RNA sequence: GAAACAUCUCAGUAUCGGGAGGAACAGAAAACGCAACGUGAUGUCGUUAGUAACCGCGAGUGAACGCGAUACAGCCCAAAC
RNA sequence: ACUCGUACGGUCACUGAAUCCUGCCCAGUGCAGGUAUCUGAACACCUCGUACAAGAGGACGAAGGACCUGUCAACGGCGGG
RNA sequence: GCUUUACUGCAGGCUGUCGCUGAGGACUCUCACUCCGGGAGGAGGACACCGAUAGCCGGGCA
């Protein structure tokens, strides 16, 4: 047949790419040697085209203008501290060791000094639970207990822009606009509505899949469609 | 059909009549050193192998008798023409 | 709209132009490559064995 | 008596034993962080270099080349192919890694000509070969009664035409008798059946 | 082509990448093995021969040594000291 | 590439606004989890074999399979008497 | 051209084994190698990646 849509994706053509040239900043944490004497004042609160959540413009003590991931409640004029012995205030970045247990945290690092990987979407938060000299157990937004290094930096508080998923898109045009700002080809034509040549579920006199939808993990790209390695399907049982 | 285990018949080796013992020919094991074995190893590469990609065929509804006629004196056996038999059981 | 005569009216783009190297009207001014001699693509001149019959 | 050279030779007979084992474990760490073709002042194997033709003279260059380990880096057929010609994984190239090395070296040095090459080891993913290259234009060679042959017009680009010892060995030209019916005088003359 | 077809065949052909010359390549035996008390670098030509060998042992594929010719030409390193 | 992205994410599919709802079936097929036991290739190892080798047998045994379980808004099924 | 539990194969995935590969049937380590860090240094670690081979799945493709 012909290569399926998921195969055209990896080629990285214009249609499947993200409008990077229209994106503001790659939100990473500031690189401090040691100490704490790094503080800044929030100049502006901007809209980030990349994640739909707001982003805070901060100017530091050493005169560095960089955008940072905005938590809830952080406004213009406010002072945020970054360092080891930073004040345990919402919006401050300090390693997981220094942050007390049972406190909601965002922009958590994987390997210490990477700039933040986990809990970065609108209104989400990671929960810090257990402490040790070796490990800091953080409960990520998916409900998974991630065992992390205590030297991994994290910003205190939940991410701003919460409850975005609550209000519906209502009309196709609103989805259109959102998708034109992301790295996604939209709209989605069902495989079952295509020809046999185009997709494993294409063909027939009526629209139904050919074989069962639950595909094996070992399936090759071109065949791996539908329910990928499903442990189960349905709602009941 | 029934077949006697021991009976008097001609021996092409001894050139006279003697008592022969009838035994079913047991399949002798393969060495894996014959020319056809070396050709399977040589001629098999990428893709189809021709004759070495073929799988063994079916069976006939009834097989012929595969027997050995062992002489009672000199102890030398001879082969005879087989006949179609559904089952061949020996007497004594 | 027909793919024939009415689609011919939009054809006012200039692509193939006179080539600096070979002199043929094959220099694609958008690709900056010559379709005849390979100027812009290779230092060597575009020649292929299929430009003639196998035994010639 | 034994030469000092014979000791470098005897060491390289077993590159995984003795002092050389430690020397390779150390040197390869630096080599892995070097380029594809790296010119070196002095050969790692002096005996082999001298045996192959190297002289500590002007216009005699040595370079280390790293080429990847394994079979062919081949693309699968995008058109109709019979079962036999449908292979990707088990296909290997008809030129050995030593020859790919000699060629990469001669291209980095468009004025020099390949004299010979030798293996200097491998790790799990790449192989290293040092190539002795000669300057046909330097009078230090044009007057050398041992190396001036390489200055002839017909020795131009000799590696790409398989005129190297590694070339001639890979072309099946070693034997003078039985088994070399389709190799001598050339593979092309024998309809490419070598 | 095999009166289908997969090994095989078309064919190492078409086509593609790299490169030299006026010609290229080969070349002075870790050869041959008419087994000899024999030959004596290498190409090429004639023959050996559709022979040996290969092969769904199908269709097909296919040398060499030797011989007769052409032309002839034999040398340099590494190491020992 | 997705990605100046990080689960309020984005990938892969199905259904097709709202409203009222969405029953029963895990035997087959699919996917996934488990598995005492059975089955399960090569390397290494042991026995025979061969002054060596081919080769024959054994021992151990991965994924997978057998077997068990989960799953139908997974393929689909919902009859005869 | 297209389909599949048609024939034969080819990619791909999973898995064992050999090489890279090191010190002291379960375990410790650090020196190769990998990743994070601008750096100091940190995480991981003879595994993973890669090369090779074997078994299973394999209309994704021929
Ligand atoms: Cl969305
Ligand atoms: Cl019988
Ligand atoms: Cl060269
Ligand atoms: Cl002779
Ligand atoms: K064919
Ligand atoms: Mg960022
Ligand atoms: Mg939605
Ligand atoms: Mg768009
Ligand atoms: Mg749709
Ligand atoms: Mg249609
Ligand atoms: Mg298909
Ligand atoms: Mg429908
Ligand atoms: Mg439907
Ligand atoms: Mg054909
Ligand atoms: Mg010639
Ligand atoms: Mg035909
Ligand atoms: Mg036939
Ligand atoms: Mg042939
Ligand atoms: Mg011969
Ligand atoms: Mg519809
Ligand atoms: Mg990196
Ligand atoms: Mg097909
Ligand atoms: Na063969
Ligand atoms: Na050169
Ligand atoms: Na050959
Ligand atoms: Na025919
Ligand atoms: Na046909
Ligand atoms: Na054949
Ligand atoms: Na069922
Ligand atoms: Na058609
Ligand atoms: Sr970075
Ligand atoms: Sr980051
Ligand atoms: Sr269908
Ligand atoms: Sr239900
Ligand atoms: Sr073969
Ligand atoms: Sr095969
Ligand atoms: Sr039958
Ligand atoms: Sr136009
Ligand atoms: Sr170009
Ligand atoms: Sr050309
Ligand atoms: Sr040149
Ligand atoms: Sr002569
Ligand atoms: Sr089931």
From Swiss-Prot, chain A:
Region named Disordered: 199-237
Ribonucleoprotein in keyword set: yes
Any GO molecular function: rRNA binding
PROSITE patterns, A to Z: RIBOSOMAL_L2
Top-rank taxon: Archaea
Function: One of the primary rRNA binding proteins. Required for association of the 30S and 50S subunits to form the 70S ribosome, for tRNA binding and peptide bond formation. It has been suggested to have peptidyltransferase activity; this is somewhat controversial. Makes several contacts with the 16S rRNA in the 70S ribosome.
Membership in a protein family: Belongs to the universal ribosomal protein uL2 family.
Name of the featured protein: Large ribosomal subunit protein uL2
Organism: Haloarcula marismortui (strain ATCC 43049 / DSM 3752 / JCM 8966 / VKM B-1809)
From Swiss-Prot, chain B:
Disordered: annotated span: 22-63
SUPFAM superfamilies per the UniProt record, alphabetical: Zn-binding ribosomal proteins (SSF57829)
Cited InterPro entries: Ribosomal_eL44, Ribosomal_LSU_eL42, Ribosomal_zn-bd
Binding site for Zn(2+): 11, 14, 71, 74
Cofactor details (free text): Binds 1 zinc ion per subunit.
Chain positions of all zinc fingers (C4-type): 11-74
GO biological process: translation
Cellular component aspect of the GO annotation: ribonucleoprotein complex; ribosome
Cofactor(s) annotated in UniProt: Zn(2+)
Pfam families: Ribosomal_L44
Keyword set, alphabetical order: Metal-binding, Ribonucleoprotein, Ribosomal protein, RNA-binding, rRNA-binding, tRNA-binding, Zinc, Zinc-finger
Entry-linked PROSITE patterns: RIBOSOMAL_L44E (PS01172)
Entry annotated with the keyword Metal-binding: yes
GO molecular-function term, one example from the UniProt record: zinc ion binding
Family membership noted in the UniProt record: Belongs to the eukaryotic ribosomal protein eL42 family.
Function: Binds to the 23S rRNA. Binds deacetylated tRNA in the E site; when the tRNA binds a stretch of 7 amino acids are displaced to allow binding.
HAMAP family: Ribosomal_L44e
Subunit structure and binding partners: Part of the 50S ribosomal subunit. Interacts weakly with protein L15e. Binds the E site tRNA.
Protein name: Large ribosomal subunit protein eL42
Organism listed in the record: Haloarcula marismortui (strain ATCC 43049 / DSM 3752 / JCM 8966 / VKM B-1809) (Halobacterium marismortui)
Lineage of source species: Archaea, Methanobacteriati, Methanobacteriota, Stenosarchaea group, Halobacteria
Swiss-Prot record, chain C:
Region (Disordered): 1-25
Start-end of Polar residues biased regions: 1-16
Zn finger limits (C4-type): 19-37
Cofactor comment: Binds 1 zinc ion per subunit.
The protein's required cofactors: Zn(2+)
Pfam families: Ribosomal_L37e (PF01907)
GO BP annotations, alphabetical order: translation
Oligomeric form and interacting partners: Part of the 50S ribosomal subunit. Interacts weakly with protein L4.
Functional note: Binds to the 23S rRNA.
Family that this chain belongs to: Belongs to the eukaryotic ribosomal protein eL37 family.
The name this protein goes by in its record: Large ribosomal subunit protein eL37
Organism: Haloarcula marismortui (strain ATCC 43049 / DSM 3752 / JCM 8966 / VKM B-1809) (Halobacterium marismortui)
Swiss-Prot record, chain D:
GO cellular component: cytosolic large ribosomal subunit
Keyword Transmembrane helix attributed: no
InterPro entries in alphabetical order: Rbsml_eL15_core_dom_sf, Ribosomal_eL15, Ribosomal_eL15_arc, Ribosomal_eL15_CS, Ribosomal_uL23/eL15/eS24_sf
Gene Ontology MF terms in the entry: rRNA binding; structural constituent of ribosome
One Pfam family in the UniProt entry: Ribosomal_L15e
SUPFAM superfamilies: Ribosomal proteins S24e, L23 and L15e
Single GO BP term: cytoplasmic translation
Top-level taxon of the source organism: Archaea
Spans annotated as Disordered: 71-92, 162-194
UniProt similarity note: Belongs to the eukaryotic ribosomal protein eL15 family.
Quaternary structure, from the entry: Part of the 50S ribosomal subunit. Interacts with protein L7Ae and weakly with L44e.
UniProt name for this protein: Large ribosomal subunit protein eL15
Species per Swiss-Prot/TrEMBL record: Haloarcula marismortui (strain ATCC 43049 / DSM 3752 / JCM 8966 / VKM B-1809) (Halobacterium marismortui)
